[PDB]
Amino acid sequence: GVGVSTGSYDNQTHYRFLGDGWVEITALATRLVHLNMPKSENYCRIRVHNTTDTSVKGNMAKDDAHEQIWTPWSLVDANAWGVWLQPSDWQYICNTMSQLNLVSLDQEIFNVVLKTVTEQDSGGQAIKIYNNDLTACMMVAVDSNNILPYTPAANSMETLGFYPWKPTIASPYRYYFCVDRDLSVTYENQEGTIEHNVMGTPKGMNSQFFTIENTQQITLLRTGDEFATGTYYFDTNPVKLTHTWQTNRQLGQPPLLSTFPEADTDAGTLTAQGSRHGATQMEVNWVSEAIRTRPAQVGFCQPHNDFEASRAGPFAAPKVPADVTQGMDREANGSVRYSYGKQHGENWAAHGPAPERYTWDETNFGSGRDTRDGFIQSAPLVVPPPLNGILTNANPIGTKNDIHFSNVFNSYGPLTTFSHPSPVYPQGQIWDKELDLEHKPRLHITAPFVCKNNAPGQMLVRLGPNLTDQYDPNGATLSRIVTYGTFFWKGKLTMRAKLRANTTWNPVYQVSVEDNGNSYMSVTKWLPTATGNMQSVPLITRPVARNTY
Amino acid sequence: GVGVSTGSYDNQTHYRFLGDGWVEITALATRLVHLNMPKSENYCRIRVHNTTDTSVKGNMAKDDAHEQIWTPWSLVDANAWGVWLQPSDWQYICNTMSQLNLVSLDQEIFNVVLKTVTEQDSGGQAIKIYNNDLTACMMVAVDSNNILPYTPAANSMETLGFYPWKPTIASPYRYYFCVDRDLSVTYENQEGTIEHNVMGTPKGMNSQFFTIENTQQITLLRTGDEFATGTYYFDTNPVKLTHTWQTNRQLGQPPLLSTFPEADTDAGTLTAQGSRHGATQMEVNWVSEAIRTRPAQVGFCQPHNDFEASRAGPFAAPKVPADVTQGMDREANGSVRYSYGKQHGENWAAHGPAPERYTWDETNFGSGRDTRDGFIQSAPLVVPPPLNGILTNANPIGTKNDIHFSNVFNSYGPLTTFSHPSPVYPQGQIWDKELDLEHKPRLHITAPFVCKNNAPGQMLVRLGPNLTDQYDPNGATLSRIVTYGTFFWKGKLTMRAKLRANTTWNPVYQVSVEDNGNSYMSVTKWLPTATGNMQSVPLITRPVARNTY
Amino acid sequence: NTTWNPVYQVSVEDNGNSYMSVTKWLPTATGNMQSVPLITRPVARNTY
Amino acid sequence: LSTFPEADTDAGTLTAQGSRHGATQMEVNWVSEAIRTRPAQVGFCQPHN
Amino acid sequence: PERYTWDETNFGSGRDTRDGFIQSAPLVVPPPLNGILTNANPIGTKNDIHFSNVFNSYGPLTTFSHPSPVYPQGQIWDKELDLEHKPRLHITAPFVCK
Amino acid sequence: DFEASRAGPFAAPKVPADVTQGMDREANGSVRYSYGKQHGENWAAHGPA
Amino acid sequence: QTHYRFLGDGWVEITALATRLVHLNMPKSENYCRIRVHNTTDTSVKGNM
DNA sequence: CCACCCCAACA
DNA sequence: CCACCCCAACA
DNA sequence: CAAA
DNA sequence: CCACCCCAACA
DNA sequence: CCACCCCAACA
DNA sequence: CAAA
DNA sequence: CCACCCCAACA
DNA sequence: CAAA
Secondary structure, eight states, X not given: OOSSOOOOOOOOEEEEEOSSSEEEEEEEEEEEEXXXXXXXXXXXXXXXXXXXXXXXXXXXXXXXXXXEEXXXXXXXXXXXXXXXXXXXXXXXXXXXXXXXXXXXXXXXXXXXXXXXXXXXXXXXXOEEEEEEOTTOOBOEEEEXXXXXXXXXXXXXXXXXXXXXXXXXXXXXXXXXXXXXXXXXXXOTTOSSOOOOOBOOOOOTTTOOOOOHHHHSXXXXXXXXXXXXXXXXXXXXXXXXOOOOOOOSSSSSOOOOOSBOOSSSSOOOBOOOGGGOOOOOSSSSSSOOTTTSOOSSEESOOOOTTXXXXXXXXXXXXXXXXXXXXXXXXXXXXXXXXXXXXXXXSSOSSOOSSOOBOOOXXXXXXXXXXXXXXXXXXXXXXXXXXOSTTBOOSSSOSSSOSSOOSTTTOOOOOTTEEOOOOOOOSSSOOOBOOOOXXXXXXXOOTTOSBOOSSOOOOEEEEXXXXXXXXXXXXXXXXXXXXOEEEEEXXXXXXXXXXXXXXXXXXXXXXXXXXXXXXXXXXXXXXXXXXXXXXXOOOOOOSXXXXXXXX | OOSSOOOOOOOOEEEEEOSSSEEEEEEEEEEEEEEOOOXXXXXXXXXXXXXXXXXXXXXXXXXXXXXXXXXXXXXXXXXXXXXXXXXXXXXXXXXXXXXXXOOOEEEEEEEEEEEEEEXXXXXXSOEEEEEEOTTOXXXXXXXXXXXXXXXXXXXXXXXXXXXXXXXXXXXXXXXXXXXXXBOOOOOTTOSSOOOOOBOOOOOTTTOOOOOHHHHSOOOOBOSSOXXXXXXXXXXXXXXXXXXXXXXSSSSSOOOOOSBOOSSSSOOOBXXXXXXXXXEOXXXXXXXXXXXXXXXXXXXXXXXXXXXOOXXXXXXXXXXXXXXXXXXXXXXXXXXXXXXBOSTXXXXXXXXXXXXXXXXXXXXXXXXXXXXXXXXXXXXXXXXXXXXXXXXXXXXXXXXOSXXXXXXXXXXXXXXXXXXOOOOOSSSOOOBOOOOOOSBXXXXXXXXXXXXXXXXXXXXXXXXXXXXXXXXXXXXXXOOBOOEEEEEEEEEEEEXXXXXXXXXXXXXXXXXXXXXXXXXXXXXXXXXXXXXXXXXXXXXOSOOSOOOOO | OOOSSOOOOOXXXXXXXXXXXXXXXXXXXXXXXXXXXXXXXXXOOOOO | OXXXXXXXXXXXBOOOGGGOOEEXXXXXXXXXXXXXXXXSEESOOOOOO | OOOOOOOOSOGGGOOOSSSOOOXXXXXXXXXXXXXXXXXXXXXXXXXXXXXXXXXXXXXXXXXXXXXXXXXXXXOOBOOOOOOSSXXXXXXXXXXXXX | OOOOSSSXXXXXXXXXXXXXXXXXXXXXXXXXXXXXXXXXXXXXXXXXX | OEEEEEOSSSOEEEXXXXXXXXXXXXXXXXXXXXXXXXXXXSSSSSSOO
């Protein structure tokens, strides 16, 4: 029974240089995991209604009231980048390869360890002895039939360790349940009251209570037991490791230069606007670099800081990423935002239960939109636009001062384009199911790859209940022995990508590691410390042009 | 699972007498090893800067400031002689065989034991109970891809026991990391200050941080698990178990004797120097035994006690071994020097944390160079050399008294030869990689054999982390159970050598063991004691001529 | 890619004054052109 | 390393030089990081100018 | 004209001439003065003329990297001196037809 | 030169090389021979020279 | 042009080309000359070696 | 899976 | 079941 | 040993 | 031994 | 009837 | 050239 | 003798 | 259209 192992340990990254710059990247990782005993061996329908940030008047974007359901089952997510790659690899990848895809994924578990603890030592100070239970279990449920919801733990930064030589932990599986809410708007102090702040009883219509021990099979794993899945093949679209910058003013034949400089420090000049040949969609007589007809609408003006509503009511409305103009609208061009803990970054030697993030500002420049240059004219596009014939960024709307029109605008015409949300080395996600909606989003912001068909089945792990001498279920609270366990986990993630060309003349930007300054990109940041702490800093993947038009 | 063994125990030395004095020596050894729990399960980049031997003025040859990196991984080295042979064997070998080589090497591990200790006994005096954990691991990583550095533990006298019936220990793996230094010279008291004694921040250029749990595979060994490597074939040059003595004055046709003695006590005499037939490379008219043109330059005059510099700055500059003339320049003819502890010699019954060595003085006589007879003449090689026409060993240089010219000299002309650094029974090394430099040393001083191609892969061993009931990695310090283990280790080392001839008339020197005196070579030195202690004394291997020219 | 730590490379920075800054390469109003000798070997090799 | 730092800003320390195990090509009794026997001679000192 | 002084990368190889250093017989660490020869110790009776200017440590225990290419300018290939014996390398070019 | 060892001295050879317009004849280690009749000499000379 | 080929086993093949247009004038002399240079203006100094 | 102080009563 | 800092001395 |  | 909320990407 | 300090560059 |  | 920023819509 |  007990004695021999069940698995190996591969946290290697294998490269294969095929024919025609068709590389095959096979990443592995064997993380050792610790899983304790669920507090409850029940299913609970728990609700949260923070009436301490909900009973204010301005605190709307602070609504955290949701009706959740807890499962004694502990999940296992590895849908992250940091778990599959190293700082180097990525560098070699993003820095060399053009595009990239996602192939297979083969998860495996082995060398299961199960131990018990007996709080002893009353005839002294206090000591907890640890011994094994070579008869114990560890229910493993792999829900591929994707019957249950899809909870990408990477969501709430609840994944698997990034440091392959550091024991990590799982994420207790919990899923959403139908309730119903109604919350009204209100500013700072406003007068009167809010009126109603109601939850929602069972909507015996949208109710959807599941049970792992009902829908998915369980493979009671002991000690000498090995659980392993099959090779899940992916059917997703590639991802381009290249960034653009071709705006609308940088697409087509530049104006004809009738005059050229005569020596550095003397630019050229075009010819009489209203005498210049070309087309335009404006009824004036003079083509400009702004008027002139182009192929499409680079990037679109999305209302920033919306805030929509429904049955759980609020909720900010995302953005599809886009640079943060020379004005750093950073909140419009919906640049994101992350907050991770040690087990996913942080100065692995910091203090204060204070998270840490790194606002991601896309590269897909020439795409972004500056909100500090809005601008809209009227009928006869009179250039020297009067005032009553324009609407700038300062012109109030709704009678609210700091409330502009760019906050409502929405320019998503059948003449719109834009780049896909690029990956994010550490933290960042990988793949993500797809909303089972008749019609669907062009993309998900939450991940560069979206399986087109079913998706990987989630892998749920639980300790098996270890009982004592007593147990009459007609017992309010039942006694169980303190049982916990180790198992290793290994992962196969396969990708296949192409090798970039070199079409320019000018070198191009890359990722490097500088001396040790203070610059974001400086070793020390990565290599350990006297003791042995370790950071991971999200890096750029896409450093390199792509001549859009 | 548990019950049956996994390996044997062979610390035998097998001989095979092939056809044509082609012997095959297959040495084995099964050392039992003890490996404790790493203090840290982290990777640390530790530095040392002894500013207590560095802030002096003369103490330069005491700089011990290096930026090291510690690995939770414990290494296993057997690249020694003492581990592969006995006092007898060697005697039989070095004493009989002419030359010798190095063939295969097959390492193996088995009968893995893993136990836990529970400090108990507060209801008394204090007792630590020991029990087993038949579910525990012991990560074994064999880095052959020689990706990581090459740390011949035999370097810092950190190898495997020599006494096959005495449990030994491994060596925690640590490797060098790029820093940068600058230290200035200074004598005894000198005036002023040193100026700067600086370390070196990350040279985000020479940085090279590795991770075993990233580059090399790990074979999670349990109790009933056996890990074994393949037979590594060697591609190195043979080694001659013969010593020379043919100087430059002992290569060619001796002068013609025109007069012979008439009875013991009356030597012969040659004929008028400046009337003697022969050649010379000196413009004089009289051939001497010193002037006369020979085939080459036996041995070369290397600057002794150099002391060069660079980025970690100092460092003595080696020497290729050469006798220690009748003047025992012992420091020039770079005779070495060892310092070992019990587990590699020492009066296995001594006291005081005081090491012990044995200055090795090569045999490759007629090669060495005496620094007490230097000598250099001028243009018209006037024999009765005036003073202002010579430069002896007493003639100052640089304005420093005890600072001579022999300290700078360097006679390594395309007419130089010399013997390879001979082995050193106990202690001494065996094989050693090779500097991946476009151009390479003719030899390594540090070992008689240097694999011409890749080299054996190092074998790294670690305990697997045994966890407790608690573990939130967002935990400053994590709790782990005191876990340690035994495993045996066995070794196959194969060599093939030739049987010496007997071309002289006069017997020749050998290795023997005298009665019990006080002489270096006297039994008692080897055989145990009342109790049972044991020495190993490095012996001579090469006792026997070889007519060089 | 055997290490863990990224490693140095050659890149082209914004336009400063640093040796490695575009403008240095791309032509000029007129059309002149420099060539600046660059580094080839940016990357370790664990000697021993 | 017989002594390890306890937190960034406190390097480790080796053990008594003339008590340290290892080899050397110098006739003294205390191995250093400069004395200690290595494989070869990295780079060479050429007469400049 | 215009140039660019090439400073190899083959670090850990280079040698600092501002830390020379040579001791005598019994390698007494606290080296007296008359028992050393530093970078400031004259030679030939010339002040700014040191011993590092004459030194030559090219023992059968020497290694070093090949002169690396030099993108622009720099050479490519170069014949080989028809000498019975030949240089280990040419500084003037990374590749030397054999 | 003049080096030493166990039979002690001995000049240290030279690999041949011209004798510059200054005829260093002893540096550029030009050699040197001395033969008798049965290998040259004015097969009709005198003096054991 | 500069053509790249990604073979099997990271064995790339780089084929570089270049077609430079060249201008070549008429040699001043259609003779062979043995010319010498002896700068006795940097040679007749004392330090200028 | 014990043969004449090793491999090897060899296979 | 150790080959030249990866897959892979590949099969 | 970088090709084969 | 993971395919589109079951058996069952069935065999 | 000369091969790498023996038989023996074996046959 | 020590294996083959 | 034009195919998806190279060789090469390869042959 | 990135595989096939």
